[PDB]
Write a protein that binds this DNA or RNA. Sequence first.
DNA 1: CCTGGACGGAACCAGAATACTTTTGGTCTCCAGG
Length: 786
Amino acid sequence: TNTSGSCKGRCFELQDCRCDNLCKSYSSCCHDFDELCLKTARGWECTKDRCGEVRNEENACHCSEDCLSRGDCCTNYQVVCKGESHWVDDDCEEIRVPECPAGFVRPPLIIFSVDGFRASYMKKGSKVMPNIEKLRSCGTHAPYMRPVYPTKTFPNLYTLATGLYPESHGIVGNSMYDPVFDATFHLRGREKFNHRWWGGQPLWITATKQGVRAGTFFWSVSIPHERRILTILQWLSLPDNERPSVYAFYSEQPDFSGHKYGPFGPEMTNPLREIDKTVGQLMDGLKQLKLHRCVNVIFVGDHGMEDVTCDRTEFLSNYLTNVDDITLVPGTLGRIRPKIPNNLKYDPKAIIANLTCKKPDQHFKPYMKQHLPKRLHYANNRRIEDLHLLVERRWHVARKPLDVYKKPSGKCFFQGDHGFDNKVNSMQTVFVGYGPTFKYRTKVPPFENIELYNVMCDLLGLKPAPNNGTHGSLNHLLRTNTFRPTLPEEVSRPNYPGIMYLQSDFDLGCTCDSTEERHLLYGRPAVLYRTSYDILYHTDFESGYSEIFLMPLWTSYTISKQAEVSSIPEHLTNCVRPDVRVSPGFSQNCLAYKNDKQMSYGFLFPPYLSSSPEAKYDAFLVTNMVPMYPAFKRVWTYFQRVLVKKYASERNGVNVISGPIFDYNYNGLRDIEDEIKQYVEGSSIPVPTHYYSIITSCLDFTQPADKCDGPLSVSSFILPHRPDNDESCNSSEDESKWVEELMKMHTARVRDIEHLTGLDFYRKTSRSYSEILTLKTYLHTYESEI
DNA sequence: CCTGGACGGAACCAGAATACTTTTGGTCTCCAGG
Ligand SMILES: *[C@@H]1O[C@H](CO)[C@@H](O[C@@H]2O[C@H](CO)[C@@H](O[C@@H]3O[C@H](CO[C@H]4O[C@H](CO)[C@@H](O)[C@H](O[C@H]5O[C@H](CO)[C@@H](O)[C@H](O)[C@@H]5O[C@H]5O[C@H](CO)[C@@H](O)[C@H](O)[C@@H]5O)[C@@H]4O)[C@@H](O)[C@H](O[C@H]4O[C@H](CO)[C@@H](O)[C@H](O)[C@@H]4O)[C@@H]3O)[C@H](O)[C@H]2NC(C)=O)[C@H](O)[C@H]1NC(C)=O
Ligand SMILES: *[C@@H]1O[C@H](CO)[C@@H](O[C@@H]2O[C@H](CO)[C@@H](O[C@@H]3O[C@H](CO)[C@@H](O)[C@H](O[C@H]4O[C@H](CO)[C@@H](O)[C@H](O)[C@@H]4O)[C@@H]3O)[C@H](O)[C@H]2NC(C)=O)[C@H](O)[C@H]1NC(C)=O
Ligand SMILES: [Ca+2]
Ligand SMILES: [Ca+2]
Ligand SMILES: [Cl-]
Ligand SMILES: [K+]
Ligand code: NA
Ligand SMILES: [Zn+2]
Ligand SMILES: [Zn+2]
């Protein structure tokens, strides 16, 4: 690079040495970049004595009479010198259409992202943050926005830009080892600048591909905030054929002060006031350009902040005798791998056993990554280590003390940290959208940050790249430019078999001593791939029975608020009955379950909830049976016998849809073409990796689930089908003490279940479709309200 | 008031050497001295 050139007339140019706002991070600036592009003289504010000054090229910004036409006024110039008001002192006025100067072809978007802005900081209100609080109350806001896991900065910022889970965009932590590159990504170092780390298609690329020009989305750490704002405002003054339409501002605060003082320290007020001042400089500057009723502004955080101190550290050396032979990414999560990459003597089975339920109130839990809760979507990337530690909120994990023998000093230089499970309340962050395209004075329910990329594409007129948002689920944020979603097309249609076989046709080794109106409430699920399946009706339930898997894809039934739970008679404990509607060759068989000494079986519709002794015999049909480990039947039985009825009594009836999931390669997608790796011994009955249930009722619970007029209410889960209950440290006790807690950990979205099964639910309701897409992205988190 | 040392491996930051990732001292406050 020839740094002998000059940045004269090129400062922060958007197209030899460089003068853009990343040259410093690459060490490519022309020698006079600092002198010409980072002026600082006289600060960032006009004063009464500067009004009408003779222009002086040394000043950071100008208060001369010409600064308006040259677009380089201080952001407060009009207020101090021409009698105008600060944007924050003006009334809220609805913006029904964009009010943009001639030559603007579309409303610009400015993304204002803050680091470590916990959702509950908004409770400080206008006394601390008057500009932000006016954006929030005049625009559209969520009470919180859910980040992705791990709740660290780089995974979340790049999720914001791409709409992808970290396992898909590839930035799975702030530091990473990639065994194929054999290289390490680190915030310190040049390797992170290599494009091979960064997957997906971020918004600035989507924009350029479709004719929408982008400003920078990265800012060099040494460029002060006021200068970033003034640069964006100067870009917005460029001619129509050079001006960008999408911009990004980033602040590292208030993350650093949160680390030092903690989220509840009175010291948090000052960094929040400082951010608010920068927001006020932007809004005043836009008002000075006559763009304050033309630009869409998004104020968004990457994650929250939790109380974490030195008194709450677990050390792996208290569990493992050789912590020198492993590498640990520590803190609010744990990722473990061998010190020597691909070391053949690395034994994660011995490691995980020593880390499982070893101390009474142990403040982390180990997982092989395929056993993490599916809602984290944190497994399908070679940069994610197989061995993972989920750390309890407010705690850290560390590798080992330096000197195990030294005394208690009581010195701690930090009080906050982030990185925990993304459903923890302290990790939630902020979302505000203000402008012509967002709604006016509107509160919307919490939503996940993977959904934002689609919205930003809608605000710019862009077709999104394939991503993990559900396009249309945030239409209720927008006054216009909504996306019109359409139902996925159904690929397979069901057969409806009648009675076709005799009992005597079956040699399964088994022994035994208004259906749609009632049990399928929202239409049958569509099967979105080619397959042969049967729909089977019974008094108490309906099912879609797969000929390939030899079991239901789904089973649907409605349990009313007054339903009765009954016992299985002792003479029917082991009853299994051939189904005369379904061929012997497309049935499971009981011999395979006897021969398999690890596998038992359960039922998708529970016999416990049968409507009469006669109807109960339907529950023992071989077409209702599914393979289950004995340890898992403890969970599933408690769900069926205890929890379904409880939910029915609390929600005024429930509709339940349950079924198997196969995801042996842990990519979150229904698996296909020989990816299933386990079968019941000697048979072609595949073994599920998970079981799901979707539990729906009326949002207005004064109406019974089967007679619901308005919006629906849903909760769901994806339970891992494990041969032991090692995940639950007190599973040796009665199920009342651990099963429900386990289920809450594995809560899921209906959407997560659609990916994993290839089914599409809620196809026949009386609701608009965009409302159903919102319902399908809902996650019941079991957390108190923020 | 001044200097040095410890803090403790967990947070962030910004100096080095281990050499652009990895590792360490500092942070604030107290202790020891002059
Ligand atoms: C969340 O949303 C994302 C985006 O839609 C979904 O991920 C997509 O999933 C599909 C289905 O598996 C993948 O399709 C397959 O694509 C490959 C070609 O892949 C290359 O080209 C695409 C298109 O440009 C790139 O996006 C891919 O990028 C991956 O690799 C680069 C370089 O290695 C890396 O930097 C990226 O981060 C990214 O890695 C991630 O994806 C891969 C899987 O591709 C995964 O292994 C990794 O760990 C990360 O997760 C890539 O450069 C194509 O060969 C395949 O063909 C197969 O299917 C066809 C039928 O379609 C068969 O006929 C054929 O014989 C093959 O068997 C697939 O089409 C797609 O790559 C992937 N996209 C991304 C960006 O990840 C997720 O599934 C969604 N998650 C959930 C839970 O819904
Ligand atoms: C998983 O955890 C197990 C159990 O902690 C662990 O096995 C233990 O490893 C240590 C280290 O090898 C063993 O060694 C100890 O070290 C001394 C000498 O240096 C031995 O004399 C000790 O025997 C004493 O044991 C008593 C314990 O207090 C002493 O008080 C007594 O005086 C004995 O002399 C002791 O052996 C330790 O023995 C094992 N324990 C068992 C049950 O094996 C294992 O290494 C861990 N695995 C992994 C992968 O980390
Ligand atoms: Ca799969
Ligand atoms: Ca040290
Ligand atoms: Cl990380
Ligand atoms: K068995
Ligand atoms: Na257990
Ligand atoms: Zn962050
Ligand atoms: Zn942080």
